[PDB]
Automatic annotation (TrEMBL), chain A:
Name by which UniProt lists this protein: Isonitrile hydratase InhA
One matching Pfam family: DJ-1_PfpI
GO biological process assignments: regulation of DNA-templated transcription
Domain of life the protein comes from: Bacteria
Signal peptide: none
Modified residues (Cysteine sulfenic acid (-SOH)): 101
Automatic annotation (TrEMBL), chain B:
Residues annotated as transmembrane: none
Database matches in Pfam families: DJ-1_PfpI (PF01965)
Name the record gives this protein: Isonitrile hydratase InhA
UniProt xrefs under InterPro entries: Class_I_gatase-like (IPR029062), DJ-1/PfpI (IPR002818), INH-QAR (IPR052158)
Gene3D superfamilies: 3.40.50.880
GO biological-process terms attached to the record: regulation of DNA-templated transcription
Length: 227, 229
């Protein structure tokens, strides 16, 4: 009867995609949160922060919510048949199938975005269409029981949105107040629409090699879905 | 590299993990930074939610830090009366470029004597405990006083870390990281501050926190007496 929430915790995850939502959702009543990988034990994030998976695929209970974070490690998962099969298995009955940032590319590689409205990190948004999604430039996108959040820190907005759906608005507001989540960013550079042009150029320049490698992975993953 | 900026977070039992992991992912995005997670010994440390983190160094082996950062959480009350942790904080603060905290981590800085006559903030529900530790309490989300930088409650860590990034590097670098993080927040509700949340929500929360507040007040006044002697 406790709500069972599971995050996929994989090597080279972007940890904040996971730890932001985790601290929001673990604050709710009658929940249990699992960190899932092929085996329990240490998993190292892209920054070198060490996290700890609490369950293997086999011992994971049926999930009410599955959540896929993003990160450098997404590329490997998009061509990992075990991970994709596990995600499909849990998505079949999950009340909600969800992701943050480039985690939606993993959902796409699993076939779960076909015909659905979805978002991802702004720098990788062009990769949603080949995976079958209708790409939407909004920070949290809901299509039926699929909820996708945009890049990294969107996980906090996503998790508060999810909290209200699992419980109600008042419960989500209580958690928002406990987290003192009234952001006041010191700059206005969080979106390519508002950041200075020089900043956008540098961020795009840094992401270019990753984007090219992910363009190639995405087209192989899409071709497998088609065949 | 061996010229890296050395950033250290105190990692303690019953920490509020987001106070640490939010800033960590921001600051680890900067060029040539090394981040340490510091406790009495290396090894696993369990956060208040059950998330397991891993300390990378002991107090004794930690190198001189450029930045020390104290997160908050249920575990702060113990730290405020831990002579070994307070001695480490004071030692590192003697030479750090920036002495910093998030959320109730500032009460630990206060217990260490580092807020006397200094402007500071903390989580909104515990803000009254700043003044007995000698601080000038400021109701702002990120507060600077010289090389001291304190963030307000939990999620303020992200705003704090981008502010610190601009001081360590420059505004252009902090903006790039903000864009890489897609940090253009759009909260689904407006209940992040006691001034904007529904009154019924603020009341419920004060009702919940009252016991912790009375317990932390007594610890706070004991810690203040130790500074006075």
């Amino acid at each position: 009867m406790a709500v069972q929430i599971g995050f996929l915790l994989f090597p080279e995850v972007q940890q904040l995609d996971l730890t932001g939502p985790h601290d929001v959702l673990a604050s709710l009543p009658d929940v249990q949160v699992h960190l899932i990988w092929k085996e329990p034990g240490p998993v190292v994030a892209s920054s070198g922060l060490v996290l700890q998976a609490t369950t293997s695929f086999a011992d994971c209970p049926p999930l009410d919510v599955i959540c896929i974070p993003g990160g450098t490690g997404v590329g490997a998962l998009m061509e990992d048949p075990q991970a994709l099969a596990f995600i499909r298995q849990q998505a079949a009955r999950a009340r909600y199938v969800t992701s943050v940032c480039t985690g939606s590319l993993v959902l796409g590689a699993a076939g779960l975005l076909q015909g659905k409205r979805a978002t991802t990190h702004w720098a990788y948004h062009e990769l949603l269409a080949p995976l079958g999604a209708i790409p939407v430039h909004e920070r949290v996108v809901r299509d039926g029981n699929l909820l996708t959040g945009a890049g990294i820190t969107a996980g906090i907005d996503f998790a508060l949105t999810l909290a209200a759906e699992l419980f109600d608005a008042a419960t989500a507001q209580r958690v928002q107040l406990q987290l003192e989540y009234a952001p006041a960013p010191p700059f206005n550079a969080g979106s390519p629409d508002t950041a200075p042009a020089s900043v956008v150029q540098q961020a795009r320049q840094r992401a270019a090699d990753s984007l090219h490698k992910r363009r190639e992975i995405t087209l192989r993953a899409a071709a497998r879905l088609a065949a």
